[PDB]
Amino acid sequence: GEFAQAVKEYAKAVKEYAYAVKEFAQAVKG
Amino acid sequence: GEFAQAVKEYAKAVKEYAYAVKEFAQAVKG
Amino acid sequence: GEFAQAVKEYAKAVKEYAYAVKEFAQAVKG
Amino acid sequence: GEFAQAVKEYAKAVKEYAYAVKEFAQAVKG
Amino acid sequence: GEFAQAVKEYAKAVKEYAYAVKEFAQAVKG
Amino acid sequence: GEFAQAVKEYAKAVKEYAYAVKEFAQAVKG
Known part of the structure; x- marks a missing residue:
């Protein structure tokens, strides 16, 4: 219910x- | 309930x- | 800057x- | 379920x- | 449980x- | 189960x- x-x-x-975590991961890596 | x-x-x-995680990712990318 | x-x-x-996580933890325990 | x-x-x-937080830690140490 | x-x-x-992020904000600033 | x-x-x-958070905390501290 x-x-x-x-x-x-x-x-x-x-x-x-x-x-959101995947975009954070890419920002930190890239 | x-x-x-x-x-x-x-x-x-x-x-x-x-x-907030996506907004912070955009600031790291930027 | x-x-x-x-x-x-x-x-x-x-x-x-x-x-919010602390509040959820309390809600689970209740 | x-x-x-x-x-x-x-x-x-x-x-x-x-x-990603560990990678962020590596960046901060840089 | x-x-x-x-x-x-x-x-x-x-x-x-x-x-730790707040301590980092202070570090990036000052 | x-x-x-x-x-x-x-x-x-x-x-x-x-x-991971303690590792980030040590990176910020150092």
Whole structure:
């Protein structure tokens, strides 16, 4: 219900964190 | 219910942090 | 100049995220 | 299910961030 | 629980990072 | 069981992030 909903929004925020980390990694490397 | 809300409020903080990580990456690239 | 300011703003965002992680940790324990 | 999966993805993101933070540390030592 | 303990350790690590980035901001500035 | 595996991976990622932060902290200090 709400928990299932909360998890979808968490999963989507994790994926945004994952790409932000990759751009940080490239900035530090490049 | 109360825990689902804490997962929702954490998901918002993960997205806000992901944005700050990308902004800092852009400053390192720049 | 520009880069000192971006580091300062990244520091504030890390500090904000630390507070959200501590709140999540408390929410998990409840 | 879905929350264990999102936590696993977050864990992989954290490991990547740790590796970039160590590379950042190498840059700061430079 | 193991999850509560791990998020507690993460909260500590992010708080330390926030303090090291702030020290770095001071270093880049002065 | 599947959550206990996600928590194990998260716990290990958090630990790597914790030592990365101390390495960044030593780079800033030095």
